Paper text:
BCL-2 is the founding member of the pro-survival class of proteins that includes BCL-XL, BCL-W, A1/BFL-1 and MCL-1. They exert their pro-survival function by binding and restraining related members of a family of pro-apoptotic proteins—the sensors of cellular stress (the BH3-only proteins) and the effectors of apoptosis (BAX and BAK). Four or more hydrophobic amino acids on successive helical turns within the BH3 motif engage complementary pockets (P1 through P4) in this surface groove of pro-survival proteins. Venetoclax competes with pro-apoptotic BH3 motifs for BCL-2 binding, releasing pro-apoptotic proteins and allowing apoptosis in cells primed for death.
S55746 is another BCL-2 selective antagonist that has progressed to the clinic. We show here that S55746 also loses potency (~100-fold) against the BCL-2 G101V mutant and we sought a structural explanation for this. To further investigate this we solved the structure of BCL-2 G101V bound to S55746. We obtained diffraction to 2.0 Å in a P 21 spacegroup with two molecules in the asymmetric unit. The orientation of S55746 in the BCL-2 G101V:S55746 complex structure is conserved relative to the WT structure. S55746 inserts a 4-hydroxyphenyl moiety into the P2 pocket but does not insert as deep into the pocket as the corresponding chlorophenyl from venetoclax. This shallow insertion allows the BCL-2 F112 on the α3 helix to insert into the BCL-2 groove extending the P3 pocket. In both BCL-2 WT and BCL-2 G101V structures compared with S55746 E152 is shielded from the base of the P2 pocket by the insertion of F112 into the groove. However, in the BCL-2 G101V:S55746 structure E152 is in an unconventional rotamer, which shows most similarity to tp10, with the Cγ deviating by 40º from the conventional tp10 rotamer. Consistent with this the combination of the G101V mutation with the E152A mutation did not fully restore WT binding to S55746, in contrast to venetoclax, suggesting additional structural features underlying affinity in this case.
Numbering used by the authors: 9 to 32, 50 to 162
């Protein structure tokens, strides 16, 4: 249902593993499992991109816009929405690692606005998140 709830719960889970208690049900567990399979799949290139990412408060919004525009340029699919969430999380984990944790709240806002403004039509026309729950899990 609520896109804002889905991003809050995904980010809270990734940060809690890092020992960072950020302050801010079937779908949440299905999304969390797909993104973990996505990390295992491209673990090689995930290490490279982590260092390649030069994240600061002055570049985050622009970095976010560029990568999201590249992901969905050739259309939307669930595999790209999964990569959308993993990029949202890698930037949150990276913010915490670099002692810029205030940016977590900005990244979650950018993810929520993009889901509601640019992914809402596609998802609903796919039947909503239950359609995602049927592919994964
Ligand atoms: O540039 C990117 C990136 C990653 C993918 C992507 C999305 C997918 C997928 C696959 C890939 C993909 O193409 N890769 C995954 C990946 C994951 C982590 C780090 C690097 C890469 C690069 C390659 C891996 N190789 C490339 C050759 O063909 C496939 C194998 O399967 C399902 O959805 N895409 C892009 C750009 C737009 C096309 C799809 N990031 C990016 C962003 C910033 C800096 C560098 C790369 C990015 C976006 C979202 C993410 O969640 C992670 C990375």
């Amino acid at each position: 249902y609520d896109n804002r709830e889905i991003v809050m719960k995904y980010i809270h889970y990734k940060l809690s593993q890092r020992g960072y208690e950020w302050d801010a049900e079937v779908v949440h567990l299905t999304l969390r499992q797909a993104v973990d399979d996505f990390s295992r799949r491209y673990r090689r290139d995930f290490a490279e991109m982590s260092s390649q990412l030069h994240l600061t408060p002055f570049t985050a919004r622009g970095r976010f816009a560029t990568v999201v525009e590249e992901l969905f340029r050739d259309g939307v699919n669930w595999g790209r929405i999964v990569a959308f969430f993993e990029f949202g999380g890698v930037m949150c984990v990276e913010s915490v690692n670099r002692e810029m944790s205030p940016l977590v709240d900005n990244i979650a806002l950018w993810m929520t606005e993009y889901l509601n403004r640019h992914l809402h039509t596609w998802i609903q026309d796919n039947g909503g998140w239950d359609a995602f729950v049927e592919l994964y899990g």
